[PDB]
Amino acid sequence: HLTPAEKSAVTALWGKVNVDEVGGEALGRLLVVYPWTQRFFESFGDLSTPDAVMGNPKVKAHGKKVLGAFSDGLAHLDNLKGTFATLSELHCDKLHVDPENFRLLGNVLVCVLAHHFGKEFTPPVQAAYQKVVAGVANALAHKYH
Amino acid sequence: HLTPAEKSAVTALWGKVNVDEVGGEALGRLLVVYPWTQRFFESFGDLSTPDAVMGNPKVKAHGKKVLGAFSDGLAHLDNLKGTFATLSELHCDKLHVDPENFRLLGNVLVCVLAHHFGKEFTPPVQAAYQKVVAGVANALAHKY
Amino acid sequence: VLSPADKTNVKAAWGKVGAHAGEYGAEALERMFLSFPTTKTYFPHFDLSHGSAQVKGHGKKVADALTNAVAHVDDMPNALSALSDLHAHKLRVDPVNFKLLSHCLLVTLAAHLPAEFTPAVHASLDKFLASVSTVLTSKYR
Amino acid sequence: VLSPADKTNVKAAWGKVGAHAGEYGAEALERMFLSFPTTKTYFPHFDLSHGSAQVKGHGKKVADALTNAVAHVDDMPNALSALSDLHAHKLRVDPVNFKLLSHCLLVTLAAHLPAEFTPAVHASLDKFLASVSTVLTSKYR
Numbered sequence: 276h277l278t279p280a281e282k283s284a285v286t287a288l289w290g291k292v293n294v295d296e297v298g299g300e301a302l303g304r305l306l307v308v309y310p311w312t313q314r315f316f317e318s319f320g321d322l323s324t325p326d327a328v329m330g331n332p333k334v335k336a337h338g339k340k341v342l343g344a345f346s347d348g349l350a351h352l353d354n355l356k357g358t359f360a361t362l363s364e365l366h367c368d369k370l371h372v373d374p375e376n377f378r379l380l381g382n383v384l385v386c387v388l389a390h391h392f393g394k395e396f397t398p399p400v401q402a403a404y405q406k407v408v409a410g411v412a413n414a415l416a417h418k419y420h
Numbered sequence: 421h422l423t424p425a426e427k428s429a430v431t432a433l434w435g436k437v438n439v440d441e442v443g444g445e446a447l448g449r450l451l452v453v454y455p456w457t458q459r460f461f462e463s464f465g466d467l468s469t470p471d472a473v474m475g476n477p478k479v480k481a482h483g484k485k486v487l488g489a490f491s492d493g494l495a496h497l498d499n500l501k502g503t504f505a506t507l508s509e510l511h512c513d514k515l516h517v518d519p520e521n522f523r524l525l526g527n528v529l530v531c532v533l534a535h536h537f538g539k540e541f542t543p544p545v546q547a548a549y550q551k552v553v554a555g556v557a558n559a560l561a562h563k564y
Numbered sequence: 565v566l567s568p569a570d571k572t573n574v575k576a577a578w579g580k581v582g583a584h585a586g587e588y589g590a591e592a593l594e595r596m597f598l599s600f601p602t603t604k605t606y607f608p609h610f611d612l613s614h615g616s617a618q619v620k621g622h623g624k625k626v627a628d629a630l631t632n633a634v635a636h637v638d639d640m641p642n643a644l645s646a647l648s649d650l651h652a653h654k655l656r657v658d659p660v661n662f663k664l665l666s667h668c669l670l671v672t673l674a675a676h677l678p679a680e681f682t683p684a685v686h687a688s689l690d691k692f693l694a695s696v697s698t699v700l701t702s703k704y705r
Numbered sequence: 706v707l708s709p710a711d712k713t714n715v716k717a718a719w720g721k722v723g724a725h726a727g728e729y730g731a732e733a734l735e736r737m738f739l740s741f742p743t744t745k746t747y748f749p750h751f752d753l754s755h756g757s758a759q760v761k762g763h764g765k766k767v768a769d770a771l772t773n774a775v776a777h778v779d780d781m782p783n784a785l786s787a788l789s790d791l792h793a794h795k796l797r798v799d800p801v802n803f804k805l806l807s808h809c810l811l812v813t814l815a816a817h818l819p820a821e822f823t824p825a826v827h828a829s830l831d832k833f834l835a836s837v838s839t840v841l842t843s844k845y846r
């Protein structure tokens with residue numbers, strides 16, 4: 276649960292976030308910092324070097340779609356489990372994705388928002404976003420069985 | 421969330437559990453396997469050797485108390501947030517205990533239950549106990 | 565950081581296992597899939613039911629891997645070089661799952677070795693399993 | 706292990722910090738206390754408000770500790786031998802809190818180094834900070 280001031284601070288920053296480019300940056304840095312998360316993208320091509328990961332076109336397409344659903348969850352911060360219920364079943368029953376990757380992606384996104392906004396990413400803003408990425412990661416793992 | 425078959429087998433196993441002896445065994449094993457948890461029990465006395473830890477009277481006299489929320493969670497199945505609204509303030513605003521140590525004790529309690537019950541601690545019985553120690557630890561850490 | 569007391573306890577504890585390694589590995593695997601269902605994402609289309617020859621087959625492989633690790637406790641990085649490479653570049657199992665399997669191995673040993681699972685051996689086995697997990701995750705990045 | 710590219714990236718990244726280490730250490734600590742309030746249990750009588758000299762004082766100590774680690778990257782277990790003993794036998798800080806401080810250090814570096822926090826430097830710093838935590842936690846048991 277987030278407070279109105281916490282919900283307003285998180286929403287205000289997202290209003291300046293370009294879901295298209297930032298999505299390809301978070302997913303790219305996730306595959307570079309944590310290279311064991313590349314087991315789901317063998318058909319994407321080559322991901323051996325960082326410049327290959329950030330330069331992969333298929334990675335940038337999946338990043339915009341991933342952060343796109345994340346953008347929809349921000350409008351429903353009071354019901355993340357129901358919002359990501361269908362995606363949680365698909366990632367589990369069909370994609371077989373380890374829910375820990377949701378926590379690794381959340382850590383990367385916080386670093387990307389800090390690297391892009393700099394001083395605007397204040398410690399209180401980060402703490403508000405730490406609860407958002409934790410709720411989205413738990414919501415995407417809620418339907419795992 | 422646990423099933424009625426899960427809650428029935430877990431309560432059946434806990435009926436044969438001596439909270440005094442099991443608590444002092446789980447609390448002592450936690451200090452032996454994870455020695456960095458001794459920071460909160462410096463007043464307990466000799467904690468150098470494992471024999472001195474298990475035989476420490478203050479350890480056994482407090483093991484029956486640490487296992488209380490596990491015994492308390494075994495009655496208030498789910499909705500542990502309101503159940504653990506005062507025990508958190510004790511270990512938080514007074515002693516300032518890391519909630520991670522509560523998770524280590526839950527895994528240690530599972531090892532103690534398996535060592536005490538043997539085959540009776542079936543993989544389904546363990547899986548049901550893991551949900552209990554995961555819900556109690558998360559509820560105790562929600563008020564930090 | 566394994567102490568000589570740890571090597572003695574682990575060798576004595578695993579020595580009592582012996583021919584029961586294949587059965588204990590299948591039990592610890594079933595305990596992991598039941599207690600931590602997120603680990604089942606790494607074995608898709610596998611038969612994970614109780615008494616499954618698919619589960620019993622892989623349980624012996626992990627047990628033989630741990631048996632070789634005990635005999636080569638002083639040469640663990642070189643003994644598990646083939647498994648560390650497989651788990652890092654082929655399986656890519658998240659390192660958080662190693663703590664779940666290590667915990668279920670301790671539960672299987674405690675339930676099956678009541679006389680040898682002393683608090684000293686318990687601490688020695690937890691440190692040994694943490695060292696095996698660290699070795700298998702050393703080549704991840 | 707730390708690759709030569711990692712040592713080059715971490716040395717280049719920390720080189721841009723320079724005299725801002727003491728100020729950045731206080732920022733990463735405040736970010737840890739705000740994002741993870743459970744870490745405040747280890748500083749029970751510290752003044753944790755904004756602009757607290759206690760936070761800036763300890764923030765410079767952790768920063769100077771990391772500065773010495775970068776210069777002795779190839780000899781890190783030796784350089785942090787005195788600090789590993791304090792955190793293991795005196796502070797007894799749970800090893801899970803080191804990942805929280807390492808994450809907040811990465812967030813502070815990314816916010817202050819926009820031209821240098823490349824994905825290669827990001828991956829290099831995460832491995833280096835994970836190595837600092839492993840060294841400081843090696844003497845725990």
Ligand code: HEM
Pocket residue numbers: 312315316337340341342344345362365366370372376377380411412415
């Ligand atoms: C906030 C976290 C995440 C969100 C919101 C998200 C969202 C999505 C969405 C919307 C899809 C497409 C579903 C459809 O086709 O209708 C998808 C698919 C997928 N996701 Fe995620 N995702 C997240 C995290 C992750 C992570 C961390 C991984 C792996 C490291 C992952 C792996 C995949 C894969 C492999 C696919 C299939 C892509 C394809 O085959 O085209 N997801 N996800």
Ligand code: HEM
Pocket residue numbers: 457460461482485486487488489490507511515517518521522525560
């Ligand atoms: C998880 C459920 C727990 C329960 C139900 C519990 C129960 C209790 C009780 C009944 C007391 C004494 C109450 C009083 O005298 O005011 C107490 C105090 C204490 N607790 Fe806990 N405890 C738990 C977990 C922990 C943990 C995780 C730690 C340390 C990491 C811990 C360390 C202590 C210590 C050192 C004391 C003070 C002992 C004394 O004053 O005699 N306990 N707890």
Ligand code: HEM
Pocket residue numbers: 603606607622625626629630647650655657661662665696697700
């Ligand atoms: C001490 C920890 C572990 C040991 C000793 C171990 C050992 C082994 C061994 C011996 C194999 C067979 C390799 C071969 O036949 O070529 C294997 C395969 C495998 N392991 Fe592990 N493992 C460990 C941890 C884990 C964990 C925790 C997971 C998942 C949560 C995992 C997932 C897998 C998978 C998916 C395979 C491939 C199965 C197959 O393709 O048949 N491993 N491991």
Ligand code: HEM
Pocket residue numbers: 744745747748763766767770771788791792796798802803804806807837838841
């Ligand atoms: C990046 C990893 C870390 C480094 C390099 C580091 C370094 C240091 C240094 C240099 C000191 C001062 C020692 C002295 O003045 O004698 C210290 C003390 C201390 N550290 Fe850490 N530390 C780290 C992680 C942590 C974490 C995660 C915690 C838990 C929140 C922690 C808790 C403490 C405490 C409580 C003190 C004593 C503070 C005082 O008494 O003034 N440390 N550490």
